[PDB]
Amino acid sequence: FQGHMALVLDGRALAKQIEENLLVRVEALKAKTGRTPILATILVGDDGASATYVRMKGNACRRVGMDSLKIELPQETTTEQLLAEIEKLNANPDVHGILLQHPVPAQIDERACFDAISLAKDVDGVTCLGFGRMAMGEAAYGSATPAGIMTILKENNIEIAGKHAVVVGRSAILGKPMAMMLLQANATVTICHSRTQNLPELVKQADIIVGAVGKAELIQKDWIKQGAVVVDAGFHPRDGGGVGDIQLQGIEEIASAYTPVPGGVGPMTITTLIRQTVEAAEKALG
Amino acid sequence: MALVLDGRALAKQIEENLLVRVEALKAKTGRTPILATILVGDDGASATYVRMKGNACRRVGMDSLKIELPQETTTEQLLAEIEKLNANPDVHGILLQHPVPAQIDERACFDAISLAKDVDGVTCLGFGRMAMGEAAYGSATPAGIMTILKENNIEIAGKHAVVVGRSAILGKPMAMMLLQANATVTICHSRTQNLPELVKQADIIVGAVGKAELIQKDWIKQGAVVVDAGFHPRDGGGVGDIQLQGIEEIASAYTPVPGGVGPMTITTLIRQTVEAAEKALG
Numbered sequence: 001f002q003g004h005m006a007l008v009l010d011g012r013a014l015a016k017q018i019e020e021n022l023l024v025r026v027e028a029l030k031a032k033t034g035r036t037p038i039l040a041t042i043l044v045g046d047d048g049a050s051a052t053y054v055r056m057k058g059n060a061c062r063r064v065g066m067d068s069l070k071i072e073l074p075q076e077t078t079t080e081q082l083l084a085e086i087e088k089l090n091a092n093p094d095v096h097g098i099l100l101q102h103p104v105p106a107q108i109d110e111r112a113c114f115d116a117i118s119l120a121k122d123v124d125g126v127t128c129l130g131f132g133r134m135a136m137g138e139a140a141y142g143s144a145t146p147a148g149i150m151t152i153l154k155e156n157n158i159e160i161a162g163k164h165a166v167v168v169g170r171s172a173i174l175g176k177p178m179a180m181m182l183l184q185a186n187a188t189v190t191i192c193h194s195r196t197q198n199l200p201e202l203v204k205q206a207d208i209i210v211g212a213v214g215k216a217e218l219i220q221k222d223w224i225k226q227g228a229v230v231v232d233a234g235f236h237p238r239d240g241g242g243v244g245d246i247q248l249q250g251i252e253e254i255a256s257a258y259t260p261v262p263g264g265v266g267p268m269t270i271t272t273l274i275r276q277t278v279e280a281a282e283k284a285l286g
Numbered sequence: 287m288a289l290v291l292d293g294r295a296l297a298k299q300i301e302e303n304l305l306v307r308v309e310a311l312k313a314k315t316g317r318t319p320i321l322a323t324i325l326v327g328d329d330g331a332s333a334t335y336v337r338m339k340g341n342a343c344r345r346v347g348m349d350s351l352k353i354e355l356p357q358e359t360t361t362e363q364l365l366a367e368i369e370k371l372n373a374n375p376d377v378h379g380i381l382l383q384h385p386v387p388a389q390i391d392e393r394a395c396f397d398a399i400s401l402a403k404d405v406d407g408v409t410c411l412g413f414g415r416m417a418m419g420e421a422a423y424g425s426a427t428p429a430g431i432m433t434i435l436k437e438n439n440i441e442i443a444g445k446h447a448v449v450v451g452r453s454a455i456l457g458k459p460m461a462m463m464l465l466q467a468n469a470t471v472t473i474c475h476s477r478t479q480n481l482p483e484l485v486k487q488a489d490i491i492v493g494a495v496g497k498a499e500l501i502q503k504d505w506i507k508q509g510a511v512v513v514d515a516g517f518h519p520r521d522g523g524g525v526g527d528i529q530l531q532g533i534e535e536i537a538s539a540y541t542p543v544p545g546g547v548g549p550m551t552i553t554t555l556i557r558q559t560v561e562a563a564e565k566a567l568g
């Protein structure tokens with residue numbers, strides 16, 4: 001019975017492992033050039049979850065020997081003001097990557113602002129250009145969460161080619177890039193959303209299921225195919241352990257492998273961002 | 287029983303008001319809209335397609351700038367030509383006819399076309415913009431298919447669409463356009479297992495494989511909407527990527543081959559050129 005239980009896809013462990021390599025790379029770069037890699041983080045407004053995510057990302061920068069430039073803008077910031085701040089960061093040669101923490105206050109055209117980030121500094125992978133390049137096999141930083149997921153799958157030797165992957169959710173920065181990344185890895189990919197009919201049946205057809213709906217435990221455990229690889233990209237704070245977008249209680253009897261929540265996708269989102277920032281700094285300072 | 291999704295008729299209809307628009311623009315500005323067409327090398331089908339596209343331009347009162355480059359053209363040479371066209375204020379749209387000779391990095395060359403002139407919808411930036419709901423010219427073939435479906439009042443929202451093929455200029459944009467129209471979308475390709483199974487569940491099936499009659503009639507769901515984007519010339523009538531002989535007994539609606547998707551590929555390109563000229567000149 002112990003042997004037949006699902007493989008835990010341990011994002012926490014993998015993130016720590018990647019960070020050890022990032023640290024030596026950053027220290028080498030600092031020694032050679034005298035300069036520290038910088039991630040600019042932009043936090044617009046007062047959302048508590050956003051503030052926490054930015055704090056965690058800054059901490060990850062420092063863990064690998066980098067630092068962050070913390071830009072904090074008021075909740076009433078306009079699109080025009082945010083664009084101007086991004087252009088300042090684009091023009092600053094000391095800034096290697098730019099993170100705009102989503103979701104910005106809703107009066108701002110978030111897409112316009114994402115698209116203003118220069119490709120070379122798009123270390124969270126949010127630009128339309130970056131998405132298009134990735135979708136067509138050209139070099140670009142990938143959207144952090146789905147790229148982190150691909151890394152988890154590859155480093156745990158999960159078979160993707162020829163498998164049926166079902167991505168539930170189609171957001172610009174998660175579901176859509178996830179789908180394109182899985183397609184590039186030769187999965188057959190189905191993309192579902194709030195207007196999908198027969199969702200339970202489509203999920204049951206999936207060899208690989210990605211929950212990206214932002215609704216706690218929406219994906220039911222009885223929809224999961226026996227032996228499926230289960231990736232839960234959600235996080236919803238709860239007293240006594242947060243939960244994701246998938247019912248994971250007892251998942252170890254159903255899945256061949258799964259990402260826990262917490263400790264699965266979350267750490268790899270942060271670490272992917274920081275890795276792409278190290279790559280951007282290595283390029284800029286070389 | 288099937289509705290014939292008549293691309294020829296729709297193209298003709300659309301060209302009527304494109305001609306009105308172009309004649310109004312010429313009268314106002316004294317300038318003729320120009321599509322630059324780039325034919326690289328000796329492929330016969332490519333030459334035919336480019337001529338058809340130039341003819342369509344002329345039917346709606348525009349003109350073409352015919353660029354013909356040799357089979358042995360290099361990536362560098364083609365990029366240089368595209369950059370000349372980008373900076374030529376007399377050129378409003380640029381078409382690079384696919385597939386270019388194998389030694390050329392076609393994707394690099396597509397991506398060199400300026401967004402404002404990307405009237406065939408081939409750039410990575412244009413694809414990404416489209417996929418995220420931002421304004422951009424759409425890849426001509428899939429955008430034409432969307433127009434056919436919409437003009438024929440085909441229900442897309444909530445339907446299970448299956449796109450067989452994932453090319454950068456056809457299957458991938460087709461998938462994203464159907465997704466924006468609120469279809470659930472499955473994208474299949476040469477590594478798909480159980481393709482017949484998946485096709486059988488398609489409410490909307492798009493054949494985008496470039497292999498004659500690969501998609502079998504027996505795989506088609508009763509009542510499906512069947513879109514065949516293939517064309518393979520044959521004596522006494524070309525065929526597409528789907529077996530369509532007898533399709534009228536199965537499909538609720540289908541695109542014939544020829545006369546379905548093909549005319550609408552051309553029309554979409556010309557429409558987007560009219561749009562580009564109106565923006566540049568108006």
Ligand SMILES: [Cl-]
Binds near residue numbers: 075
């Ligand atoms: Cl707010």
Ligand SMILES: [Cl-]
Binds near residue numbers: 135184185
């Ligand atoms: Cl792909």
Ligand SMILES: [Cl-]
Binds near residue numbers: 337339340341350352
């Ligand atoms: Cl011509």
Ligand SMILES: [Cl-]
Binds near residue numbers: 341342345
């Ligand atoms: Cl004619």
Ligand SMILES: [Cl-]
Binds near residue numbers: 467
């Ligand atoms: Cl969409």
